[PDB]
Amino acid sequence: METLELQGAKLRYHQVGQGPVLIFIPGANGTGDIFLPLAEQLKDHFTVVAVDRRDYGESELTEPLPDSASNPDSDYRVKRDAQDIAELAKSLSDEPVYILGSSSGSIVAMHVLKDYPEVVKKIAFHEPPINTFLPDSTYWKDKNDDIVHQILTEGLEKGMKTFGETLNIAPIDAKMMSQPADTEEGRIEQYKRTMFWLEFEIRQYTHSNITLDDFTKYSDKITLLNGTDSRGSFPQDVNFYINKETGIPIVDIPGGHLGYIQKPEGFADVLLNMWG
Template sequence: MTVLGVPGARLYYEVHGDGRTMLMIPGANGVTEGFRRAAEHLAAHYTVVLYDRRGFSRSQLDGPQDYSRRLQTDADDARRLIEHVGDVPAVVFGASSGGVVALDLLTRHPEVVHTLVPFEPAAVLQLPDGQQWVAFFHEVYDLYREAGIEPAMRRFRQHAFPDADRQVMARAPKNEANASYWFEHELRQYPKVDLDLDTLASRAERIMLAAGREARGYPSREVNVVLGSKLGLDVIELPGGHVGYLAYPAEFAHELLDALTQGACGPKNH
């Protein structure tokens, strides 16, 4: 088992393939497994680094945690992994909460990022009705405390994702410890992050906003639509919805590779 010691944690990670480094930052489940099948296709072109974010599964905490700075800590963990693997700068793909981490990584540590792909980042405060979504996530947290994980997860999925995503999510392996950690330390915190749009705009040539074709009208996809308008960027569409990399791993990987090859990041061409 490959582990990188970082302040307050030991990060489990895997390295697959050859070429420029591509770090894949997982979302709410916090672990490598959701990306594994897509990574099999990406590894023909990149050195793909998969990892469990700190506090999830094999990335154990082993020191004090400053949860008031958890997002910054997540971004610093990603920086340390990229530098440890040794090929800097890297392509960074982050999904959902991992997309929020990826945006913070580019903001704080631009030297390690070649191309950033935030896939449906959960920064819903960017939306016109963002405060309502933040309030909804607090309601989901309260339901978790009152009735447990499953009722809260059902309500979360029913309101925030299309049916195709809900079916995939319902079939995914369950890990109560990971779910509890997410409820306590992420569900209410990451959606209300205040992105540094001025800094991101100054680095927009490195950003490739991506979203699922089947997720139109749902919050995480619409975050990138709003970011696109604010940063002057197009949004590329990839197969499936919010978890298209899990539902259609080969197609998702191939279209992502095509977009990266064509240089789909940077200002709009129209």
């Protein structure tokens, strides 16, 4: 694949053929390989250029995406995609070029014509899903908003319940762990937190490289703590096993898994007797 270095990304593209430049902009799949059979039909008439949009395929970002890009009224990515096509056209051709986009790629194409019309000789919009200018825009926008919200959230909320039952988490803890944050910003962060924890923390931490020998070397320093109100939960069985194999003491301490905030006075007083 060829590469054009632009601000914030290396833009990769396929190129075959001879003649005027024809740029294909992919839709939701994001990659230009889907146009290669077509390019083989067109290569005697056009210099065909199939682009992997910067967030997909063999293209790569060289700076993080702005944090705000997850906002549904962000316009950074569509404008940056359009600028990518314009700078690609300028790098390959001293004349305006032919452009075809499909699906979200036809929306990119729209923004190329809006912002960089001077690079466009002729342009085609194949099956665009844009709604902004439609009489029923709000209907389709609200449908998109609803479905995205459904996909991103409901699997996660059900999954945390399943985890709770596998771990035998106590109701007093589960009610607290599932309570919504008190701000729209916090509720967004809450969701982001939990998805991050699922993908980047639970599996990595729970199967990380700790052995019982790591404990025996410093056994005099260690206390194991089990909540009085979280009996029967998985972590208590972990502590029972550690104690079985090392003799490190288990100390019962008030509350459940969140006992340090459920019963702070009792949690503190046990720590003070331990260490104070």
